[model samples]
Target: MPLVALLDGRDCTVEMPILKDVATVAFCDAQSTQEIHEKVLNEAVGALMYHTITLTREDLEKFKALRIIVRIGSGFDNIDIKSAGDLGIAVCNVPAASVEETADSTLCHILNLYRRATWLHQALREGTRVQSVEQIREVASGAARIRGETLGIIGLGRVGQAVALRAKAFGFNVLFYDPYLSDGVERALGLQRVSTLQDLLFHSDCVTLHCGLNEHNHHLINDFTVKQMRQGAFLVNTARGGLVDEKALAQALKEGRIRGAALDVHESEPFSFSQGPLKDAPNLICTPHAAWYSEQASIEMREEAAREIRRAITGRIPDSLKNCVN
Candidate 1:
């Protein structure tokens, strides 16, 4: 029997009855690499579904029967792509599953920061019960109109372009910094491009990150880079957490260097509320990594992964590979 394994199935929500029609599915939550090898090696698994677990090069070498690995979400930083490609194993992710929802989350964060919507609501509920116009104005001292502010996007990917369109609707002067994109994007999107990251940091009133997490761009927003940003500028991150130095960001918020920030994702999963750096930081909104989630998006994400695995194992190869990383 040709076997397909769902490694780390405990965290997955979708019930993939579609996969059983073609091949046997072994659902597993083995913590260690040895445990994984022991559990599925005998089955001669042809496809592997992954969630949050780390798969190193050493780990990939042992899965001899593995022909495809499907990451059940957009990001695949946890998997070793190079070794998988070298071993003739195909790696894939469902990148299109949550593009609009994630972009909406980024724009929501931007609006909250600029309008002081969440902050004032918190003050009315937690700090002061009832207040006059002057008191409300005092609470929202830094609040400003969103019409003329500059919104700098870090990467002009699908989500970034979506955000740029939304930001334009709100009359923001949208600027972007992405070295990988060619010159025509600015003209297509009706936005200006900055030649360097530092130039984008220095010019914009608000900065939003939409870049991928990789070795070259890890900690892309560290201490020095954060300082380069315009004084009192706002920050928003709905992308990977590894892109920013959390400690540096926390301190920046504490010092009032950056006026405010909203983070939907963090470097650590289930970010430590008790001991996290942002716990005491002012003017910061930390969501539980729920940016990529809508019930519809979640269903689409899981079902798409299942469909990809099905295509890979069914031997009906056409242009069926959806989002292969390598």
Candidate 2:
């Protein structure tokens, strides 16, 4: 039997069926600096099931027996995939498993920001029922109707396409900006292909990012691009947190350069800010990096990831492999 160590214990349970034949090593959530350091000190781990933890090249080198790293969810930006590739260790993620759920969450964020749902809920909780209509009307002034608005999607992958379909149903004009999309895909989706990010920002009233994270895309939405956006435009990011500069976004919101912003991910996992510009930015909604945490999506992701790990240990190619074998 092989030994598999699951580094973070957030969404995982200790009684999973996949552990029937392997040794299960459970560590406290390793998303923090202290937890990560402690997990690297343990020596008996053969493989790792990672979740929302930052694994560096040093961590990869320390786990001598580590052959595969499986992410509990679709996003693996928390792990160092490039280093795993160089070390001949297979890194697998359950991509597209939570497509529907994530798309739903993204839409929820969009609607909440567009309609000021969070503020309204808070007002009602504070015994402000009589003024609800007036407040809603005031808030609704900042809201943009989905009809006739251009929705610019950064990536045209499964999640992006799902969101696009929903937006189209709500009368949004869809514009896609992915270089990797094929002509057939564009034709089938009936989406206009925007050549540059700047063009998308300028033309679209609502821009949502669903692209992968990497060196090129890190801090992609900086001050320059934020300035390129149409005034009073809305921004949504359900993708990686590092893709946007949070500080810049806060400033944009404060200055009224952007109307509102909604984020389901943050640069720091389990991120909490108390006093910075983002701490109390007006018209901003932030979630705890949970765009893919619906009950059904969670189960699908866990089961799919477990199956991939089983295949990896049994010398079979998993159906969700991300790396190319040369």
Candidate 3:
């Protein structure tokens, strides 16, 4: 039988027998580094699945043969994709798994900020069941009409396009800035495409980031870029944490340059702003990078990855090859 490996046991939904029936299924915690590190060496495996653990140059050196590497989510910056493709190892990711849920989370944040949902709840919890308009107006004055407002989306990829669809449905004029695509791609999506990043920031009423973080655009939303955005514009980031400069973003919120922001991903895993620069920032929300989760999507992501492994081991090409450097 061919071999297949799962990076960790965290995939609670995917049955072990599913992949095991067709291949040698090994559960290796990729972060442990040394436990299954040498065990995977000199092994003829069909595929290896992981959640974001780095597969280093030295780690790849030990593998004698392999067919594919499947990442659980959209981002694959952790893997050494360049040399892997050179070695004829195909890489893949399940982008379809959580597209809708993430887009929905983005809209949730936008609507939450616009309506002061969290602030209202927090105020109620603080013993203000009802406050007079004169007493509460200044406290919850951020509420606004959704119609005719502009929403700028960065990176018109899978999740970004999903957000634009919902933005249009919500009666917000949509705009996008994606360096990879041309102006012609805008007609089908029903959104305007800006020429540069600055154009999107300056013109929109609210901005959301959906770009993947890589070497080229790390900290893409730092001090300089944040300043270019229209004052009091709300921001949302569900894509990657490294894409935004947390310190700069906190400063913007404190200074009242940017109105509000929400984040699902952060520069660090299990990120907590409760005790840091962002603690005092106004009108901010943070979730634990959970936008891509739902009962159905979790299983779909894992099963799709498993199916890709099955296909690759069965002498077939898998779909959605990442790092197709070859």
In the order shown, what is each candidate's alpha-carbon RMSD?
A: 2.2, 2.9, 2.7
Task: Candidate 2: list runs displaced more than 4 Å.
Answer: 10-15, 23-25, 32-46, 129-136, 273-277, 316-326
User: Cα lDDT of all candidates, in order?
Assistant: 0.83, 0.75, 0.79
Comparison by lDDT, 1 against 2, better one = 1
Tell me the tens digit of each residue's lDDT in model 1 across 227-304.
Answer: 999889999999888798988899999888999999987887667667666778878887888888898998887888
- For model 3, residues 198-305, the per-residue Cα lDDT tens digits are 999999999999887777999999999999999999999998888988899999998989888988987766677676657677778889888999989988787777
Candidate 1 RMSD to the correct structure: 2.2
Query: What ranking emerges by lDDT with the best candidate at the front?
Result: 1, 3, 2
Candidate 3: which stretches are off by over 4 Å? 12-17, 30-37, 41-50, 274-280, 316-326
Worst 10 residues of 1 by lDDT: 43-52
Top candidate on TM-score is 1
Clashes of each: 0, 0, 0
User: Could you tell which candidate, 2 or 3, scores higher by lDDT?
Assistant: 3
> Candidate 1 versus the native: TM-score?
0.92
TM-score of each: 0.92, 0.89, 0.89
**Error of model 2, residue 110, in angstroms:** 1.1
Pairs clashing within candidate 1: none
